[PDB]
């Protein structure tokens, strides 16, 4: 009865920016998703392909726990078939996504008076992300026709924008920590089951 180290992912000290979203591979452990679902702690816990009410009656080969931080109003974008800055340039879920999206407000931790600039998100990109793609390039985005020559200015933009995380913001603009649980299913022995 090895329990899955979800405390490492959820109760982590620091979370990654969405463009540099972090991933934790989870295998050979017993996962109690039910405790999380009924936790009164997370503001969002929506599943796709599975039903959260009795999903710990299931087994998978591996579980990917992606973690990052976004703005509250952007939590709606962490879902299959969504458009927006985050879903296009930061974190894309596939149309056939099978897994859960968990988000909780972290204003008390990831805010700072006058703005916390630790958390950034990609604002420009030549094309949309493929599902589960991670792009950490800091190349000067060329919006115009003349090359940027590695210097930014007119039609030459730095691709990452910073959240100005002040605790005085509205909810839509407060920091939310997000964990996406993806359930990978290979032709191999299934190593992550629930309590039964």
């Amino acid at each position: 009865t090895n329990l899955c180290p979800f405390g490492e992912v959820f109760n982590a000290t620091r979370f990654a920016s969405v463009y540099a979203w972090n991933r934790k591979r989870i295998s050979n452990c017993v996962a109690d998703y039910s405790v999380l679902y009924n936790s009164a702690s997370f503001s969002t816990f929506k599943c796709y392909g599975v039903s959260p009410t009795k999903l710990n009656d299931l087994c998978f080969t591996n579980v990917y726990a992606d973690s990052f931080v976004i703005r509250g109003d952007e939590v709606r974008q962490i879902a299959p078939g969504q458009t927006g800055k985050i879903a296009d340039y930061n974190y894309k879920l596939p149309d056939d996504f099978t897994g859960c999206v968990i988000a909780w407000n972290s204003n008390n931790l990831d805010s700072k008076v006058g703005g916390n600039y630790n958390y950034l998100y990609r604002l420009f990109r030549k094309s949309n992300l493929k599902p589960f793609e991670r792009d950490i390039s800091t190349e000067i985005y060329q919006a115009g026709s003349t090359p940027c020559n590695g210097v930014e200015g007119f039609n030459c933009y730095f691709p990452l924008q910073s959240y100005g995380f002040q605790p005085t913001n509205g909810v839509g603009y407060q920091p939310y920590r997000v964990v996406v649980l993806s359930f990978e299913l290979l032709h191999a022995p299934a190593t992550v089951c629930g309590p039964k």
Partner: antibody
């Protein structure tokens, strides 16, 4: 425009029954949890019950447990509170309140709740 | 049962005063806290919904702060239509519980 219209209150003797309904319009009714909140005359607010959008999860205050039953017909966009074994202390104005996004697939914005309340209906239990 | 303690129970102030109402929770409720106003004979109207997030259509003199166990509703400059009763509500854990209420009266 979100709208909740209650009906079904009235005078009833102790031990009697009464079934309140709250008709909803202007939003996806089947996607949000719904609440009943009562207020006795000249006293404070008291939460009564919650039902999930799916209709699968129901939670009650202890003071009405086992007597009241919350339910919903999503096809009619209506919430119901069935009050049996009514006691005089249940005399109150009963308000219907829109809760947080609580789907068949999970919950979304658990902070955003009680944004919209029904006009309330009066339930007077007395002998 | 999480118990919400409002202070003060009653309070009288003049128009223009800065009014501060406190709500303490017996346990942690994170940010699942709302502030409602109730005029006599009317329906509760929401003023603040995520302990600090103002409701659309509510004047900016109203503001909410705090988290964990202590929370504060504040009116910067009182106004005639602000004389009412204010309730705080935790909706973190069942059963959801309101505060005892705070009635804001006119001072003479």
């Amino acid at each position: 425009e979100v709208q909740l219209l209650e009906s079904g209150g009235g005078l009833v003797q102790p031990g009697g029954s009464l079934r309140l309904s709250c008709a909803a319009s202007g939003f996806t009714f089947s996607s949000y949890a719904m609440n009943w909140v009562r207020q006795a005359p000249g006293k404070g607010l008291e939460w009564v019950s919650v039902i999930s959008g799916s209709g699968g999860s129901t939670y009650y205050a202890d003071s009405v447990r086992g007597r009241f039953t919350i339910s919903r017909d999503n096809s009619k966009n209506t919430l119901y509170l069935q009050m049996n074994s009514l006691r005089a202390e249940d005399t109150a104005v009963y308000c219907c309140a829109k809760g947080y996004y609580y789907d068949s697939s999970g919950y979304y914005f658990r902070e955003d709740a009680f944004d919209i309340w029904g006009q309330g209906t009066l339930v007077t239990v007395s002998s | 049962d999480i118990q919400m303690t409002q202070s003060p129970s009653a309070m009288s102030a003049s128009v223009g005063d800065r009014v501060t109402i406190t709500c303490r929770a017996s346990q942690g409720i994170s940010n699942y806290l709302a502030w409602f106003q109730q005029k006599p004979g009317k329906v509760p109207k929401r003023l603040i919904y995520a302990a600090s997030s103002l409701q659309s259509g509510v004047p900016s003199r109203f503001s909410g702060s705090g988290s964990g166990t202590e929370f504060t509703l504040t009116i910067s400059s009182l106004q005639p239509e602000d004389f009412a009763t204010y309730y705080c509500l935790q909706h973190n854990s069942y059963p959801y519980t309101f505060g005892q209420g705070t009635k804001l009266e006119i001072k003479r």
